[PDB]
Amino acid sequence: CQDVVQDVPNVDVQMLELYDRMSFKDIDGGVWKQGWNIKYDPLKYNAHHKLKVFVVPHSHNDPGWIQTFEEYYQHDTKHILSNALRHLHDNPEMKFIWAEISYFARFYHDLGENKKLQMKSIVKNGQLEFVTGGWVMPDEANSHWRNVLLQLTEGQTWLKQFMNVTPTASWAIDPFGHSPTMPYILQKSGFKNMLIQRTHYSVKKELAQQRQLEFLWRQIWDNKGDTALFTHMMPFYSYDIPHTCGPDPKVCCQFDFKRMGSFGLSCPWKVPPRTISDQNVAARSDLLVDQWKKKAELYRTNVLLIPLGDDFRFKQNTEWDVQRVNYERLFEHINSQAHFNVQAQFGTLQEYFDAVHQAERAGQAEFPTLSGDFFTYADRSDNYWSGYYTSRPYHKRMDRVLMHYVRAAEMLSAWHSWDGMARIEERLEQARRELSLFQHHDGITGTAKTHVVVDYEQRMQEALKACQMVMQQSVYRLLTKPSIYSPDFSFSYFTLDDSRWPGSGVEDSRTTIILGEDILPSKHVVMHNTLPHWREQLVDFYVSSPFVSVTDLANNPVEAQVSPVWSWHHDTLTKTIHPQGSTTKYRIIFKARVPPMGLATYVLTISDSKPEHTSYASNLLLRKNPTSLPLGQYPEDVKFGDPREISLRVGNGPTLAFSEQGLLKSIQLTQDSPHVPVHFKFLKYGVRSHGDRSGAYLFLPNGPASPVELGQPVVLVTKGKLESSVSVGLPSVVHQTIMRGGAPEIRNLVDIGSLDNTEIVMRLETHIDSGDIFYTDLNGLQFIKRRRLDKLPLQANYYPIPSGMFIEDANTRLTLLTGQPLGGSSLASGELEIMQDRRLASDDERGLGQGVLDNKPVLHIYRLVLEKVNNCVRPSKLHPAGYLTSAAHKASQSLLDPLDKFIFAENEWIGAQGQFGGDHPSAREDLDVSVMRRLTKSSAKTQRVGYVLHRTNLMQCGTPEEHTQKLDVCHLLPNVARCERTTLTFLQNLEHLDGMVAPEVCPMETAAYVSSHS
C-alpha cells in the first residue's frame, strides 16, 4: 500500500500551486476573448505529417432543466434519437456520440423490434458511440462519490445488457467545474480517457500556453501514478459550435449550418453561415482550416478534436442534412487539396483518443502529469459559479437521505433471494434510477426551473417509499423464525421512523407509538446498522406516554430518557418565535447497539408511573415575558428565566458554553483544559444593485456578509442524562446544539421565507491560527487543501462543501461535517462559514430564465468536532491533501449513514427474533462496505452478490489500534463457489481470487468484489 500522507507526489501541474502563481488577469485577448491571437507555422504540416481532424457530432440532452425529463423526451429527445437512427442507418460515414443513458433507455424500450435491431447495428458498427454511459452527466461538485458510482453503474449496466458495449471514454461538457473524483471512479471502472470543458477561463489560458490541456490526471495523494487517467480539457468558452472549431467564434459560427433563419437561430457575431458550393468551398475551407490549425497549436499531437453540436441538436431531418451535406462538401475539398495537408472526417470520441495515443506511442508527444481539481469555475470576468453549491438546499439534503436509503434497501434485501412476486428488484431499480437522475448537473445543483425541481422531488419521494417497502419486508424476513414467516408482499410490517427527514418543523410525518393499558401495552422496534462494525447510537421515538421503559429481546433493561416534543412557531400575534410542547406525545431516547451490517430489536413498554430505568429531562425556557408551558403527563415542570449565558456537559464529553442568545461561544474538551473560543454567528449576503446579479448559478455578493440582527431571541434549554440541547428561534433559523456525550450535533431549521435577494450564512469564529489555509472535501471522498486568495473576489473563495470542511494550526483543528452539500469557505484566519439558503429575485443569464424564489423549510444537520492535533502525523506543508481524525470520520458517518429505525405495525410480532448479524465481522473503522447488491434474480442457478469496499485514511494521532476482524465480503453469504475482483460497476471480472477470499483494500482505495453462490 502506498503511503498517502508522507510522500508529496511529484507532478508537472499541481492545481493549488498553479493557483498560487497565476495572476487571473481578465484581459481582452482579441477574437479569442480570453486567450491571445494564435499563430502557427504553415510549414508544420506537410505531405508526410498531416493534421488528422475528427469532427464529432453530438447533442447535449439535459435530463431535466427548463423542461422536465419527460417533457424534453416527448418534445425533443425521442425525435433526436429517432432521426439519428434513420440518418446514421442511411449515411454510413456519418457519426454521432451519445452521453445520457436515462434518455436512451427511455427511447429504446419504446422502439419496435425492427428498430431495436437497426439501433444495435449502428452501435455495433461504430457509427453511434456512447460516451461515459452513465444514467446522466453528473454534477461534480455536490454529488457524493457513491451516487456518481451508482448512476454510472445504472447506465453502463443497461448498455451492457442491451447494446453489448461498455464505454471506456468519458464526455463531461457541462458540469460547472470538475472534480478528480471522476477520473478516480472512471479509472477503476475500466476507463482509459476522459474529456472536460467547464474550467476557469484563466486556467484554460494558462494550460493552453504550455500545451498542458491534455494531461494524465492522478489523485492528489498518488505518488506512484496508478490512479492516472488521460484527460482532454477543451480550450474555449463553450462546447457549442462557435466555440469548438477554433479561436474565433465569428468564423466558427459560420460553420453551424443550423443557423440560417428557417430554424430560428442566427450568429450573434453577425456573419451567417453560407451553404457550401463549388464556387465558395475553397474560400470557406481556407477559413475553416485556418481555425483548425490555430486550435491544433494548443495541443501536442497531429490529431485534432472538433466537437460539432449544442443543446438538443440533431432533431429535425433537415438539420441532419444541412450539417452533414455541408461538411461532406468541405471534407471532399480539403482532403483533396494537398496544400492544406489535412485529412478531415466525421469521427467518434474513442476514435479521437485512439489516434492521439497512436501518435503518443509513435513518440510524437509526451504528456504532462497533473493533480488537483477545477473548482471554482468562472466562465467570464468575476462570474464565479459558487451559487449552485447551495441553491435548492432542501433537495441537496434530500439527495443524502435517499443516498442512504438506497444503500440500506439494497443491502437489507441482498441477504436473501426473493420471489419475483415480492417486486424487490422492481422497487430497487426505480429507487436507483430516480436518485441517479437527480445526480444530473441541473438536478442536485439546484439550477432547474421550479416545476422541474418539483418533478425531481416527486421522483425522489417515490424512490424513498420504494426503499422503505423493500427495507421493511427485508427486516421482517431477517428477524422472523423461518417456519413462521408468512409474507404478504404488499403489507407494511414496519414503518420507518426518521428523526431528521423531512425533519421537525418541516413535515409532521413521524408516527407516534400509541401505548395504553386499554389498547396496547408494548411495541417492538428494530434498528439496522448498514456500517460493517458494531455501532452504538442514541435513537428516539415518539410515544403516547412519558411512562415508557425499554428492554432488549433478552428482556434486559436499557437506560432511557424521555423529553418533551417541542415545536417552534412564528407567533404572528406576539411577533416572537417560541416553542410549544406537546401534551399528547413524548420523545423516548435510548442507546441502541447494533451488529455490523445487522439488526437489533428492542421493546418499549408502558407502565402507570415512572419506570426504574427511564429519567426525564428538565426544560428551561429563557425569555423575558414568559407564559406557562404545560406538558400533559410529563413529570417535570418547565422552568423560566431571563436570557443568560449557560453551560452544559453530557456524560464525560465536552462542556459547551452558550451566549444569552443561545449560540455556542466555547468548547472545553476536558475538566482541566481551557474553554476554547468557538463562536457561531449568522450573517447575510445581499445582491448588487448595479452590474451582474446573483442567481441559481452565480454568487455575486454586494460585499462581505452583515450580521443578522437577532433581537432578544427565545432560548430553550433541555437537560438530560443521555441528551441535552440548546435551541434558539432566530430570524429564518431555529438553531439547535445537541449534546450526547461527544462532539455536538448542530441542526438548523432554515426558513428564508420572503427575504428576497438574501443568502444566509452560518459562520464559526475561532482563534485557530489557520492563516489563509482551509480544507474542504470532494464528493465525500477526499479532503483537499484550499488557499484563500485575496487576489480573487469573495465568491471565488467559496468551494463545494459536500460533506465536510476544517481549519487547523499546529495544535488545534475545528472540523464541521454536513448531512447535505452546501457552499462555504474560510474568509479570515480562524473562520469557517457555510451557506444555509439563498433567495434570489433575478435570473443570472445562464439560460435558466428565473431567479430562486421557491425556497421551503429545510432541516440542515452537522457535527462540530474541536480536537487537539499536535500529536497527529500530518502531511508535510507541501502536500495538497488533508485527512480526517477517527472522531471526525465517525461523526460524518453518523450524519450520512445513521441507524435506520423500524416500528412494528401490528399489535403482535409472532416469531420475532432479537438480532441479526451478530456473527458478521466488525471491520477496522476506516473500512466501509459502500455497496452490497445482489446482482441476480431468483431463477439464476448461480447467485451473485456484488460489494464495493472503500478504505478512507484517518490520521495517526496516538490512539492504540486495537482488535477488529478482517472483513472478507466473499464469505458474508454461505456456499461461496467463487470470488472475483471486478470493475466498480461489477461489469468486468478482473481477478479470480484464491481461496475465494476478498482481500481488504488500501487507504484511499476502493475495490469491488463479486461472490458467486451455488
Ligand SMILES: [O-]S([O-])([O-])O[C@H](CO)[C@@H](O)C[S@+]1C[C@@H](O)[C@H](O)[C@H]1CO
Ligand atoms: O444558456 S443557453 O444559452 O440557453 O444555452 C447554452 C448554449 O447552448 C448551454 O450551454 C446551457 S447549459 C445547459 C444546462 O444544463 C446548464 O444548466 C446551462 C448552464 O448555462
Ligand SMILES: *[C@@H]1O[C@H](CO)[C@@H](O)[C@H](O)[C@H]1NC(C)=O
Ligand atoms: C458482444 O460483444 C462481443 C465483443 O465485444 C461479441 O463477441 C459478442 O458476440 C457480442 N454479443 C454477445 C455474444 O454477448
Ligand SMILES: [Zn+2]
Ligand atoms: Zn447540461
